[PDB]
Amino acid sequence: ALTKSQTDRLEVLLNPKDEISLNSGKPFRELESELLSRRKKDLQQIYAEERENYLGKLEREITRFFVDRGFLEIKSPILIPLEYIERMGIDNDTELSKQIFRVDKNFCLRPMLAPNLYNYLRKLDRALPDPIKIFEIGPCYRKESDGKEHLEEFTMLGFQQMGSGCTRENLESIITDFLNHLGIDFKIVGGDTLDVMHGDLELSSAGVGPIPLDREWGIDKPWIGAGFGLERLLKVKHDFKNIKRAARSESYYNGISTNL
Amino acid sequence: ALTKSQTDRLEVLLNPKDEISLNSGKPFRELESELLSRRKKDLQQIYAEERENYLGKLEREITRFFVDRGFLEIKSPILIPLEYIERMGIDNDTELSKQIFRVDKNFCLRPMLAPNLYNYLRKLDRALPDPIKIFEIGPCYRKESDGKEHLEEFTMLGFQQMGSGCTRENLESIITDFLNHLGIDFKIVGGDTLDVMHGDLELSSAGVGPIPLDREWGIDKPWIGAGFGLERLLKVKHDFKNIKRAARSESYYNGISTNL
Ligand SMILES: Nc1ncnc2c1ncn2[C@@H]1O[C@H](COP(=O)(O)OP(=O)(O)NP(=O)(O)O)[C@@H](O)[C@H]1O
Ligand SMILES: Nc1ncnc2c1ncn2[C@@H]1O[C@H](COP(=O)(O)OP(=O)(O)NP(=O)(O)O)[C@@H](O)[C@H]1O
Ligand SMILES: N[C@H](Cc1csc2ccccc12)C(=O)O
Ligand SMILES: N[C@H](Cc1csc2ccccc12)C(=O)O
Ligand SMILES: [Mg+2]
Ligand SMILES: [Mg+2]
Ligand SMILES: [Mg+2]
Ligand SMILES: [Mg+2]
Known part of the structure; x- marks a missing residue:
């Protein structure tokens, strides 16, 4: 009988592709030594042969996808004025107001x-030809209850197109090409809203404008856009049972435990 | 006579390569219209032809340099325990304690x-062969007095090697190859410390261990490493007069004013 604490320890060391039954007769000590050896070899192979971080590599792959598709790469501040939250319509009744760091x-x-992204669309509308296509990838922060699908520090991809061609069909086409490119299964379920689901997991929320909120941001053109969590994409792609395996972390490297 | 406020406005619109004398007889209104046209064309050319952000592209170029040189790419948390600051020896007498967000x-x-980076070196020392070579690029935050060389939100490159080969000569060779690869002029000036200067501007501080601080982090091997500000590298490379031109910003895109 493995204790529940010894099983938690072995499950830290277990990778989805492992073919090992934790419930079989071998003692903890031996099962731990086998898995430690495997995870050490896994890290050695990464260090010898590619050396790229899952989150960095995914950001670079997404960047090439969107640049290639005619979207301008934005890097905007992570620390933002608190007034932006209110101007997004995030009042006390909405749950997010309680989630702000x-x-x-x-x-x-x-x-x-x-x-x-709203601010960039408004400013760039003054210099760039129609339609204006932009995207950003980077850290975002929310206070969350403990969950296998939520991090307090995560990474989001946001893209937005403004002007002509801003139809729901074009939006679904971007999403569909994007996720088929990455090899992620999905279903689209649906001011017009749209969620991109993997089973019960939300990969993205997407939108079609105009909406009344646009006016506060100086926007008065149609638009389409979406936001995706990179760690959720990694979780699906690598079949991680907990999203902590995909996060910025000192505890995992490319989903491999660093506590060896 | 241009007013000092009209000159501030024109200098926002001036790029280093511009050949325009702000002091010549043409009226503000005309000089503003010329520069607005130029900056709009500059943005249009970026949008038509490459579409990559300076800070993202620099991060990707640095990443390839270090991966290629055998360094493991790390992405670790940006929001960290306050206890890490104290354990770095940052007490109230040191100026940084007052700079913490x-x-x-x-x-x-x-x-x-x-x-x-210390935590990763300690953990990876358990799985990887000697020497252990790692690097990270990402956001860092400090409270600063207003300066043409300091941002409160900046991006840092940190690399560290631990074990064999950790000599000052090898450290200077990495720095030298790195900056010659990027095309940035520098001088190295020098627990052994080393600063990498561009004129009076500090591009990097670098170090050679062991040092007594290592013990608090579970480190007991020699090491070499350095930290570089990406926005400072961009400022030098593009001859920006103020580092705000290179920052994560809503006010500048690749050093071009977005207020057109
Ligand atoms: N705490 C989080 N951790 C990881 N990814 C997240 C988190 N919050 C949002 N995301 C991702 O960012 C996308 C866009 O954000 P958003 O639509 O606001 O999320 P959401 O509606 O709060 N999703 P959820 O909290 O799971 O019901 C989501 O679809 C996720 O893929
Ligand atoms: N506020 C900042 N804005 C931009 N870059 C910075 C900032 N602080 C540090 N850096 C960069 O990060 C590198 C390593 O950090 P560090 O050696 O701690 O800086 P520092 O000693 O405080 N430099 P300085 O404040 O200019 O005297 C520096 O050499 C810079 O290239
Ligand atoms: N639910 C949204 C996701 C998002 C990011 S950019 C963007 C542009 C259009 C639609 C959605 C988004 C949000 O919370 O940001
Ligand atoms: N002055 C240092 C720069 C740095 C980052 S990683 C690293 C590893 C070795 C030496 C320096 C550094 C600092 O403040 O971090
Ligand atoms: Mg949520
Ligand atoms: Mg949602
Ligand atoms: Mg300083
Ligand atoms: Mg320094």
Whole structure:
């Protein structure tokens, strides 16, 4: 009989592709030594042969996809004015107001990319030809209850197109090409809203404008856009049972435990 | 006579390669219209032809340099335990303690990469062959007085090697190959410390261990490493007069004003 604590320890060391039954007769000590050897070899193979981090590599692959498709790569501030949250319509009744990491008196860690993308669309509308296509990838922050699908520090991809061609059909085509390119199974389920699901897991929320909120941001053109969590994409792709395996972490490297 | 406010406005629109004398007889209104046209064309050319952000592209170029050189790419948390700052020896007498962005009661936005790199070196020492070579690129945060060389939100490259080959000569060779690869002029000036200078601007501080601090982090092997600011590298490379031109920003895109 393995104790529940010895099983938690072995499950840290287990990778989805492992073919080992934790319930078989071998003693903890031996099963731990086997898995430690495997995970050490896994890290050695990464270090010898490719050396790229899953989250960095995914960001670079997504970047090439969107640049190639005519979207401008944005890198905007992560620490943003608290006033942006209110101007997004996030009042006390909405659940997100309680999820904000505040910094100082007038700043917060951004929980979303939409504010900065709105500001860029408005400013670039002055210099760039129709349609304006932009995207950003980077850290976002939300206070969350413990969950196998939520991190407090995560990474989001946001893209938005404004002007002509901003139809639901074009939006679904971008999403569909994107996820088939990455090899991620999905279903699209549906101010017009749209969620991109993998089973019960939300990969993305997507939107079609105009919506009344646009006016506060100086936007008055149709638009389409979506936001995706990179760690959720990694979790699906690598079949991780807990999203912590995909996070920025000192505890996991490319889903391999670092506590060996 | 241009007013000092009209000159500030024109200097936002001026790019280093511009050949225009702000002091010549043409009226503000005309000089503004010329520069607006130029900056709009500049943005249009980026959008038509490459579409990559300076900071993202630099991060990807640095990543390839270090991966190719045998360094493992790390992506570790940006929001870190406040206890890491104290354990770095950052007490009240040191100036950095006053520079920390605190979050909640027990967390902060990291002002440096050294804590997470120490933790990774210690853990990986258990699985990887000697020498252990790692690097990370990502956001760091410090409270700063207004300066043409300091941002409160910046991006740092940190690399560290532990075990054999950890000589000052090897460290200077990495730095030298790196900056000659990027095309950035520098001088190295020098527990052994080393600063990499561009004129009066510090591009990097570098170090050779062991040092007594290592013991608190579970490290007991020689090491070499360095930290570089990406926005400072961009500032030098593109001859920006103020580092805000290179930052994560809503006010500049690849050093071009977005307020057109
Ligand atoms: N805490 C989180 N951890 C990881 N990914 C997240 C988190 N919050 C949001 N995301 C991702 O970001 C995308 C866009 O954000 P958003 O639509 O606001 O999320 P959401 O509606 O709060 N999803 P959920 O909390 O799972 O019901 C989501 O579809 C996820 O893929
Ligand atoms: N506020 C900042 N804005 C931009 N880059 C920075 C900032 N602080 C540090 N860096 C960069 O990060 C590198 C390593 O950090 P560190 O050696 O701690 O900086 P530092 O000693 O405080 N430099 P300085 O404040 O200019 O005297 C520096 O050499 C810079 O290239
Ligand atoms: N639910 C949204 C996801 C998103 C990011 S950019 C963007 C542009 C259009 C639609 C959605 C988004 C959010 O919370 O940001
Ligand atoms: N002054 C240092 C720069 C740095 C980052 S990683 C690293 C590893 C070795 C030496 C320096 C560094 C700091 O403040 O972090
Ligand atoms: Mg949520
Ligand atoms: Mg949603
Ligand atoms: Mg300083
Ligand atoms: Mg220094």
